[PDB]
Structures are given as C-alpha cells and as structure tokens.
C-alpha cells in the first residue's frame, strides 16, 4: 500500500461527483458538511476511496428513490471521522456485525454489501474503526482513521 497526504474532503467530493447523476436521477436529497475544510490525512487514498464509494453506493441502494443521504467529516484530536447516513429502515440488532462478515450475502439489488473489505481497509490497513448505528429515521456508517500511520 501507498500512503500519501491528501485532503479528505476533496476525496469525498470526488466520490460525490461519481454519484451525482444517479443521486439526482433518483431524486435523493444529498448533503455534505465538514468542520474543517482543510482536513488532511496520511492514508492510502485509493483504498479510502474504495470505502467511500462502497458506503455511498450502499446508502443510495438503501434509501432508494426520494431518499436522503448526509455525509459529515470531522477533525478529531489524533484522528478523523467520516459518517455516511441515509434515511431508511434501521439495521436489526442481530445484523449489525454480521453485515461485515465475508459471508454475509443475504443482500442483492444485484450487488454484495462489500463491508468486510471496508473493514479490512479501515481497521487492518489503517488501524481505525468502522461501525454502524441507527439514528434519525435512518442508518449511519461511521469510520475513523488515525490522521497518520504514526498516530495509530
Ligand atoms: C436531507 C439530506 Hg442532507
Ligand atoms: C467493496 C470494497 Hg469496501
């Protein structure tokens, strides 16, 4: 893996641009907010991009037509936190960790959830944490990564 310094918000916007047409076609209300425009991390940009694409794809599928997605990025002491929320039904308590298993596959609309690989990227490769919670009439997926491999 290749760690480089990059603006995390720039990467989030790059991923939004990938989905902009689909989001609009589906009439989804999307918003992105940050608490620090110059939020920079040292991480593997390609791999973090893969996690973002996977979470946004899942948010769109989950929220469906006329849905809502909100992304936030937050600058924490030795880490950053990215939260991707969608309006939709809550994840049942028994499935919260099972969705991250390489052998969760009770999921279609044509595609697997990809979350075991997201976990590998966030937790194994970057020493962070990724989890889900139910909130505000929807579901959030949150990841945190150390700002540098040295703050792991
Ligand atoms: C109402 C979706 Hg930022
Ligand atoms: C499908 C890579 Hg999180």
From TrEMBL:
Domain of life: Bacteria
Residues annotated for ADP binding in this entry: 58, 86, 105-107, 111-112, 115
Part of the whole protein covered: 605 to 755 of 755
Keywords tagged on the record: ATP-binding, Coiled coil, Kinase, Metal-binding, Nucleotide-binding, Phosphoprotein, Transferase, Two-component regulatory system
Annotated ranges, domain Histidine kinase: 2-149
GO terms, molecular function: ATP binding; metal ion binding; phosphorelay sensor kinase activity
Protein name listed in UniProt: histidine kinase
GO biological process: regulation of DNA-templated transcription; signal transduction
Organism: Thermotoga maritima (strain ATCC 43589 / DSM 3109 / JCM 10099 / NBRC 100826 / MSB8)
Binding positions (Mg(2+)): 58
């Amino acid at each position: 893996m290749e760690f480089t310094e990059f603006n995390l918000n720039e990467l989030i916007r790059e991923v939004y641009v990938l989905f902009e047409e689909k989001i609009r076609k589906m009439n989804i209300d999307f918003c992105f907010e940050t608490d620090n425009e110059d939020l920079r991390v040292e991480a593997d940009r390609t791999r973090i991009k893969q996690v973002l694409i996977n979470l946004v794809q899942n948010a769109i599928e989950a929220t469906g037509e006329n849905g809502k997605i909100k992304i936030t990025s937050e600058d924490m002491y030795t880490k950053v936190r990215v939260s991707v929320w969608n309006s939709g039904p809550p994840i049942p308590e028994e499935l919260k960790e099972k969705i991250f298993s390489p052998f969760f596959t009770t999921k279609t609309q044509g595609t697997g959830l990809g979350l075991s690989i997201c976990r590998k990227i966030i937790e194994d490769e970057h020493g962070g944490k990724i989890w889900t919670e139910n909130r505000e009439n929807g579901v959030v997926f949150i990841f945190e990564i150390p700002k540098t491999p040295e703050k792991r």
